[PDB]
Nucleic acid binder design. Structure first.
Ligand SMILES: [Mg+2]
Ligand SMILES: [Mg+2]
Ligand SMILES: [Mg+2]
Ligand SMILES: [Mg+2]
Ligand SMILES: [Mg+2]
Ligand SMILES: [Mg+2]
Ligand SMILES: [Mg+2]
Ligand SMILES: [Mg+2]
Ligand SMILES: [Mg+2]
Ligand SMILES: [Mg+2]
Ligand SMILES: [Mg+2]
Ligand SMILES: [Mg+2]
Ligand SMILES: [Mg+2]
Ligand SMILES: [Mg+2]
Ligand SMILES: [Mg+2]
Ligand SMILES: [Mg+2]
Ligand SMILES: [Mg+2]
Ligand SMILES: [Mg+2]
Ligand SMILES: [Mg+2]
Ligand SMILES: [Mg+2]
Ligand SMILES: [Mg+2]
Ligand SMILES: [Mg+2]
Ligand SMILES: [Mg+2]
Ligand SMILES: [Mg+2]
Ligand SMILES: [Mg+2]
Ligand SMILES: [Mg+2]
Ligand SMILES: [Mg+2]
Ligand SMILES: [Mg+2]
Ligand SMILES: [Mg+2]
Ligand SMILES: [Mg+2]
Ligand SMILES: [Mg+2]
Ligand SMILES: [Mg+2]
Ligand SMILES: [Mg+2]
Ligand SMILES: [Mg+2]
Ligand SMILES: [Mg+2]
Ligand SMILES: [Mg+2]
Ligand SMILES: [Mg+2]
Ligand SMILES: [Mg+2]
Ligand SMILES: [Mg+2]
Ligand SMILES: [Mg+2]
Ligand SMILES: [Mg+2]
Ligand SMILES: [Mg+2]
Ligand SMILES: [Mg+2]
Ligand SMILES: [Mg+2]
Ligand SMILES: [Mg+2]
Ligand SMILES: [Mg+2]
Ligand SMILES: [Mg+2]
Ligand SMILES: [Mg+2]
Ligand SMILES: [Mg+2]
Ligand SMILES: [Mg+2]
Ligand SMILES: [Mg+2]
Ligand SMILES: [Mg+2]
Ligand SMILES: [Mg+2]
Ligand SMILES: [Mg+2]
Ligand SMILES: [Mg+2]
Ligand SMILES: [Mg+2]
Ligand SMILES: [Mg+2]
Ligand SMILES: [Mg+2]
Ligand SMILES: [Mg+2]
Ligand SMILES: [Mg+2]
Ligand SMILES: [Mg+2]
Lengths: 84, 59
RNA sequence: UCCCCCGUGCCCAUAGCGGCGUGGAACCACCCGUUCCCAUUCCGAACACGGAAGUGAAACGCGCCAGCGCCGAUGGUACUGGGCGGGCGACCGCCUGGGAGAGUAGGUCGGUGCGGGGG
RNA sequence: UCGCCUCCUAAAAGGUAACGGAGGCGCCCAAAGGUCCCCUCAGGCGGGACGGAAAUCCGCCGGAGAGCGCAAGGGUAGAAGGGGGCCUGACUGCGAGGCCUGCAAGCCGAGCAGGGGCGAAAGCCGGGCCUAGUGAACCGGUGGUCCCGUGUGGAAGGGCCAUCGAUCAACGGAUAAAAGUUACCCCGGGGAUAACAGGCUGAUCUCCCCCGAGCGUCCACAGCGGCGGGGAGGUUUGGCACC
RNA sequence: GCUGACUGGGGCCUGUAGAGCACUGAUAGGGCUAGGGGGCCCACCAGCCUACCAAACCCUGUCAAACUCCGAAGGGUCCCAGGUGGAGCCUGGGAGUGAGGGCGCGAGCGAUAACGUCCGCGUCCGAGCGCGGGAACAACCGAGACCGCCAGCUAAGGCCCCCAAGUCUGGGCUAAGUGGUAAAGGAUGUGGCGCGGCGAAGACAGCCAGGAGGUUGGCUUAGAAGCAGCCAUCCUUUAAAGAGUGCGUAAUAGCUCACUGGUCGAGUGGCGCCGCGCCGAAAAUGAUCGGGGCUUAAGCCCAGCGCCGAAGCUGCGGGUCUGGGGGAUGACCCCAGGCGGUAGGGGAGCGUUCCCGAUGCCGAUGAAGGCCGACCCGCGAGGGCGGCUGGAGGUAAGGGAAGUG
RNA sequence: CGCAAGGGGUUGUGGCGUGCCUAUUGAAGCAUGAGCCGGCGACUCACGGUCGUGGGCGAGCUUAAGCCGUUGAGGCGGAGGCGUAGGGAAACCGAGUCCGAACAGGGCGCAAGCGGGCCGCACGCGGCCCGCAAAGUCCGCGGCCGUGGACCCGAAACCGGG
C-alpha cells in the first residue's frame, strides 16, 4: 500500500458562462424590443433605430428588418431598417 | 430535365446521421435499390454528400 | 454647365505622416483692440466681443515626390468539409471540394454627393 | 474543496468535464450619481532652481500603449477619462417586446401617466463603462395602510404596502437546538471500491546497445565510458481498478 | 397539416487550424550604445581603451492554451427552394433512464504509459453475444435476421490441401522462411535511379622502380628527428616525392602511403537516392504463419480476366402493420411501403376457479382426471377427434367476477 | 407401420454449434441461484384523486343515512355534493376584476355555435331535433396517483407485559 501524502491545488474555480454574442443577424425580421446583440463593451455600436442598455445591450425599437454595417475605424453597427 | 438515377450500393450502417438522413431525403431505403430523381441543385446536394454509398448515372 | 474658395456629409490610409510648390483679388485665417455680452484653476493663449492699419509668416487650401506608413497580385505552399489508407507509436499519405499567412512583382501622396460666394 | 466574478482549457455560434492551468468577490461612492459647458493622455527627445531615472514647467514628436476605486477580460479620447455650475431620475404608477433558462431566479428595456433635474434648444436622467460585492421560504420587529376583527361597539391579534434580523459561506438554505469511540462489535449491500494474487502499463527496477569527454606510461574501445541517446525484460516499488 | 432531418442559393455573425510578431511576454547572436568591474590616466572640466557585466534601440533568426497586424476549412442563424417521413408541431395519458463501454478524431490529466481518466463530434455494443469476414473474439471490415425454398447475383474476405472458388494471365522484387510483426545504430546483401571524376595522348587493381636535398621546420626540463599545440603557413634538384598516410622506436633506425616512371593494356573508383532483405533481437509447461505445407511462390509490389462467398440483393410462395383505394362496405380483393430488439408503452388473444345461461343440456352405449397419438384447426397460448385407463360427475353459444398460468 | 406415396424408432459418418436465470459497460464463463420431480409461492382491495372510456340526463346531474317491499324484487328518501362567474389578502365589485390618481398600461377573467334531417308548411325557419356540446354530472370499465403492510420474502435492532 503506497499513498504518500498527496499534494493539493486551489485554482480550480471558474465563472458562469454568460451566453453573450449576436442574437439576431441581418435579414432577420424583429419586433420592437428584440435584443439583437448582447455584448459586454461596445463591440457593436447602436445604429439607426437601435437602443443601448446599461450593458451596451443593443435592442431594436422599430418593427422591421435587421442589418449591420462596417464603418472601419468607426466601429461596426446594427440598424433595423423599418418594414416600409 | 435530366433525371438522375442514383443507386444505393454501400450500407449506411456506421456513417454519421446526416449521411443516413441524406439517403432518406433522396428516397433511398434498402440496398441496391435505385431511384430516378429530377436533376436539380438541391438533389445533387445530397447525392454528392452520400455519393460514397450510391452510384450515379444520368438519364 | 466649367475652374477657385467657404461651409457639409459619405467612403474610412491606395483617403496620412513627413519633405518641396504655391495661393489671398475674393472668401478664411493671423491680426488691431478687449469699453461693452462673455471669459481663464492664471493668461482675451482658449472661449468672446468691436473692429479693420498690415499679412499669408503661422494655420489652412491646392499641387509635387516615394522614404516611412499603407494597399497588395499571380503563382506555390500550410491548413482543412467530405472520402479512402499507412505506422508499434510520435505521426504520416492518396482522392475530391475550399484555401490562407507571410514573401515577391506592383499599386498609392485620394474619390465623391448637397448647398453657398466668386471668374 | 463547497456560493459568486475574469481568462484559458472549449475543437472561430451557444454550451461543455477533471483534486486541469492563473487570479479576484462577500465591498465601495452623496459624489465615484443626473445634466450642461469646457478640457485630452502615456511615454520618447530637448531645455530645465532644489530637481531620483517620473514632482510641477516650456518646446516639439506621440492615436492611444495613459486613465477609468479594486481581479481579469471586453470596451473607450468623435470619452466611459480630466475640470467647473446647478441639481437628486440612487423617482412613483406601469411596462410592448425580448436575452437566459428544467423549476425560480438573472438580464435588456422602448413607450404612457404623475411630479421633478439640468440645457437656449434638440434632448438626456428609472444610479455608477460593463461583467463579482450575494441568500428562497418560514418566524418575528418597526413604520404606514383602515381591509378582517368571533352577539354589538372598541380593543387584542392578523392582513396589505414599506423595511429590518442569515460566514442559513456545506452559500437551492435538514432541527430553534448536536461531538467522539468500538480490536466487544452487529445487519444490509459492493468485486459499483481498497489490501492478496492475476491482468493492462512499464515511470521506477534489472539487463544490453549507440556516441566517444576522458582514463589507461605511450594509446578512445585490454579493461573502462563524462555529458547525453535507443531498447529489451516484467522478478521491485508503484499507476490503473478489468474477473 | 409540409412546417422535419438532409440539401441548393443568398446575407452576416466567429477567431480554431495555419501563420505572424504590430500588442503582452519569451528568445540566440550581432550592431550601436545609459550605466557599472575596470583600463592610459592630463585630474574635475571633460577624458581614451576594454575577445568581461550590460540597458533601451535597430538587424538577423525564432517561441505562446490564458499573445494576435492576420486568418481558412468549417460551423451557427434567418430568408427563399427541394424534401409525404413510424418527418415535424400542439394538448393530454403511461413510462423507463439518470453505473455506460469500445473505436476514430479534437484537447486536458498522466509519463502524448495504461483494456487509464475527463470533456467535444461520430459510430457501433448496450438492446444486433442474430448472420459473413477477421483462426478463435460485445463494439475492426461486411451487413440491419417477418416465415419458407435441394434456385440466382453479390459484400468484406478469399480462390494449394484442411476449406467453397484460379496450383489464373502478363512485368517486376525477395533468398530470409523475410513473409509469420520492435528502435537508435551498424554493414562490398541484393535490384534500380542519379549526379559528378577519372580512363585506349593507357586509367582501376596487382606487380617493378623512385619516394630525395632544404633539416632533426621552429616550439617543449626531460627528446618530440614527417607522426603532442602554433605562427610563416612556404622553398630545392625534379618524372615525382610531404615541413608528411598509417605501423613503429624512449628518441633516432626501420616498414609504408601520399605523387609518377614503367610494365598490363579495358573500364574503373566517389558519393546521393529507392525497393526488399542481414544484424541489432534474452524469460520462464510443448511447439507452430490457425495447421499441413509454400521459394519464377501458396511471400511482397503493379496491371487484367473470372469465379467463391451473408440471414445483404433478386426470383417464387406465404403471414402481418400502416396508408391509399375497391367502395355494390364483399372487413374480401389488387396497389405501395414497412415488419432485429433490452428498460418500457400500446393492441389483440389462449387457458384456470367460480356465477347467470340451468326445473336446461351432456353422462354407466361411461363424467372429471390420467396414459398415448405419425390425424384435424390455430401464427402462438390452445381447441379438436381417436385408442386405453377411470367409475360419477360435467356443463355451449353469450356474457359476468377473480385467491387465475 | 401401410397396397402405395409416405410415416415412426435408432444412429454410422459429414457440416454447424460457448447451458438457464440473475446481475452487468461486458458472462460458456473460473461472477449469483438451482440435486431432480410434484404441490404452495409475489402488483390486490377500500376510500379519495386524475386522465381515458361505455352509457343515462343534461341548465342540470345525483342522493346518503334511513323508511316501506322482497327473502337472490325493488321502490321511496333532496339533508347533502358537484356544476351554472371570475377577480381581490380582504371589505367588496361583477363580465368584469386586481395594482394604480389614471377611461395609461398590464395580470387573471368572457365573449359556443351547429354538421344539420324534418317540418308549422308567415317566400319566414320557428324550433323540434341533433352530437353530445354551450357543459356538466351520474353510474360502469380501464390506466396512473394519494392514504393504508400496498408487488412478495429478508434484517442488525426499538418498546410493552411476562
Ligand atoms: Mg440606459
Ligand atoms: Mg462498417
Ligand atoms: Mg465557444
Ligand atoms: Mg465549435
Ligand atoms: Mg457634475
Ligand atoms: Mg422566466
Ligand atoms: Mg366584537
Ligand atoms: Mg546512459
Ligand atoms: Mg508480472
Ligand atoms: Mg472506470
Ligand atoms: Mg419548405
Ligand atoms: Mg428548418
Ligand atoms: Mg444553406
Ligand atoms: Mg491562437
Ligand atoms: Mg498554432
Ligand atoms: Mg449559410
Ligand atoms: Mg420518432
Ligand atoms: Mg407524452
Ligand atoms: Mg452519471
Ligand atoms: Mg463509470
Ligand atoms: Mg460516473
Ligand atoms: Mg454514448
Ligand atoms: Mg461519458
Ligand atoms: Mg462514445
Ligand atoms: Mg489518452
Ligand atoms: Mg475506459
Ligand atoms: Mg486509451
Ligand atoms: Mg464523471
Ligand atoms: Mg444499435
Ligand atoms: Mg456483432
Ligand atoms: Mg459470445
Ligand atoms: Mg463476427
Ligand atoms: Mg469469425
Ligand atoms: Mg428488417
Ligand atoms: Mg458468382
Ligand atoms: Mg471484391
Ligand atoms: Mg476447393
Ligand atoms: Mg528488423
Ligand atoms: Mg533502421
Ligand atoms: Mg510473377
Ligand atoms: Mg432480406
Ligand atoms: Mg407485405
Ligand atoms: Mg418487433
Ligand atoms: Mg344451474
Ligand atoms: Mg354399460
Ligand atoms: Mg370442476
Ligand atoms: Mg397468486
Ligand atoms: Mg450482482
Ligand atoms: Mg444494461
Ligand atoms: Mg463451470
Ligand atoms: Mg456459474
Ligand atoms: Mg453479488
Ligand atoms: Mg439467480
Ligand atoms: Mg452451489
Ligand atoms: Mg420444482
Ligand atoms: Mg413444481
Ligand atoms: Mg377509485
Ligand atoms: Mg379511476
Ligand atoms: Mg383588465
Ligand atoms: Mg416482507
Ligand atoms: Mg420488563
Amino acid at each position: 500500500a503506497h499513498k504518500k501524502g498527496l499534494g493539493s491545488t486551489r485554482n480550480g474555480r471558474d465563472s458562469q458562462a454568460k451566453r453573450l454574442g449576436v442574437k439576431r443577424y441581418e435579414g432577420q425580421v424583429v419586433r420592437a424590443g428584440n435584443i439583437l446583440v448582447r455584448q459586454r463593451g461596445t463591440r457593436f455600436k447602436p445604429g439607426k433605430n437601435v437602443g443601448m442598455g446599461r450593458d451596451f445591450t443593443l435592442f431594436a425599437l422599430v418593427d422591421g428588418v435587421v442589418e449591420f454595417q462596417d464603418r472601419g475605424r468607426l466601429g461596426r453597427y446594427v440598424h433595423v431598417r423599418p418594414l416600409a | 430535365m435530366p433525371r438522375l438515377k442514383v443507386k444505393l450500393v454501400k450500407s449506411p450502417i456506421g456513417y454519421p446521421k446526416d449521411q443516413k438522413a441524406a439517403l432518406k431525403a433522396l428516397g433511398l431505403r434498402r440496398l441496391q435499390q435505385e431511384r430516378v430523381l429530377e436533376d436539380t441543385p438541391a438533389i445533387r446536394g445530397n447525392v454528392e454528400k452520400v455519393a460514397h454509398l450510391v452510384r450515379v448515372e444520368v438519364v
